[PDB]
Amino acid sequence: QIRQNYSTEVEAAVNRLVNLYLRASYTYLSLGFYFDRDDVALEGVCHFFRELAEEKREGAERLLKMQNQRGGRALFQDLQKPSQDEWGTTLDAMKAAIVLEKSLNQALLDLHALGSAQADPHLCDFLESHFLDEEVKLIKKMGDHLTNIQRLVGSQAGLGEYLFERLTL
Amino acid sequence: QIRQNYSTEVEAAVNRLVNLYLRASYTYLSLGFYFDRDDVALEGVCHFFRELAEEKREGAERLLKMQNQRGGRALFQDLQKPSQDEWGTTLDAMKAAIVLEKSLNQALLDLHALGSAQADPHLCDFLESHFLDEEVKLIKKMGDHLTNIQRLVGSQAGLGEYLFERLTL
Amino acid sequence: QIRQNYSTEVEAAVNRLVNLYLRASYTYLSLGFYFDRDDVALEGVCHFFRELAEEKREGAERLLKMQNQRGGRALFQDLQKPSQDEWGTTLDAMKAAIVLEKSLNQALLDLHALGSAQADPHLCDFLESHFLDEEVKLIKKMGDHLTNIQRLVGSQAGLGEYLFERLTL
């Protein structure tokens, strides 16, 4: 058929990466609606996490498209529900979001390493152009938010959270 | 004449609901001008309650229009003055506004229940399309405001009230 | 808080309905990418199921928004993977899609019935306006497709599938 220089190991890892992205998307949808509760009511934080949900979903779809293009076979698994039902403060949420992005990034780097080992340049390029740079920029942005949240919730935690949501997000 | 499947019980309840809406409107006009006093001076809160006064007045007029369309007879009663002359802080005001909206909502649901009992689908539809959804959205919005006010007036009550009026309203 | 006339039974059912919609969306994403395989290659069928994936996701998000507005608490569960990994012919796929939509519709009607029992008109209206009509139109459309597929794959199954994808989808 069309399949060429595309190892079963890469195929399998691509499928696992699809699962991680759809799970991240699901986590971010839960984060977003949490911040939209009447007893939380931080619209800007809700909007930030809903954007991220969409981004992660796009990520998965690009992976799935790439899987088809290489002649791999997509295989879907159960999507585990997010690790929490309530996400605490903006501070807690942004910490959990960075932890999540780091673990996506690590999976991207593992796939890239596998790609190199197998001499699969097309895999490596595709991750490079579409995933690795974006993750880096996103993680930088989240780190910056985290610094600003922390500096604001020194004293006057409630005031700090409100001001962050209003003037940054 | 035109009157068809429109019970005297519904007619009476519609008239009482008109009275509740005009009273709410009157309450909100008093809330608005309170916040416009030189010793209160929270323009954004004044503007929020003046919008609500207009909305409640529209509500009443739609009810009165519906009463005519069904061939009921409008009957006006005295409008009781608002329960307070001074409304305290933004926090106090938003609490009183939610209490008021809840009691409008309860009257809307009672009318709907009566409408069902009497097999009056047109009444039920009219409340559905024009009143029940709006009340839900409005009460959600007021709950959100209340959360933000409370989080801001933890410490530094005056600063918190100012920031809310400036950055939310 | 804001919660008013919103029973724990309705809250629970809304959460289950969110799960069904996200599962449908996941099924449709798997259907779409299946038809985009190089050994299936029916772009119009891929595009039809990818539209449906997006629609089901929107459905879930509206439900989640409604849950917040009523003061319910969203709770996420694990999303079960689609019931199949390969979906056979366009005929097989459209049959499975109708079965799925019927089961969403049945859940919508069950929720509506619960809504009535609990005298929760806002729930009933929300399902009415946003879900019940769309499901009906969608199921009609899928039935129509099914008739056309069947009439085409009488003899010359491959020719019939190609012509359907090209001239209908």
Place this chain on the structure above:
Amino acid sequence: QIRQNYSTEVEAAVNRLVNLYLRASYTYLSLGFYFDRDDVALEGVCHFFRELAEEKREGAERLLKMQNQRGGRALFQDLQKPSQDEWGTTLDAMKAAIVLEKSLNQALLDLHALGSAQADPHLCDFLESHFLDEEVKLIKKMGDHLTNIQRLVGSQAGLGEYLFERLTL
């Protein structure tokens, strides 16, 4: 001069790759004019292969430009005539086109592997951005066409070929 980190092995391989691309272009020009014969008369297939002829020629010219930029020396060889004078059916032609693209892709991957061995990142990047992704997409597209042709020429080969040329190409 300008030449830096550009091995004679890479230079030689680039020259061979130019020859393969110009040969592919020549093959596609022969495929195109075949389908434009009065006794074949499949304009859409002619147009598809004439586009590919132009694409392969562009490919060669980019390679030759890159050779100059690195300070390599272009060397031209004889271009072998296409392996066939007549190309059979659309099915036969699309099979031969996929075989050809696979062999271009393999040469691109070999050059990339050489590029890595020699620590020549600029070579690797240039193939990545300009060649490897396009080949993958093209081979996917040709596989898809092949599936559709095959499904159509089950029974009624002539009808199937006509419909493919009219509704796909």
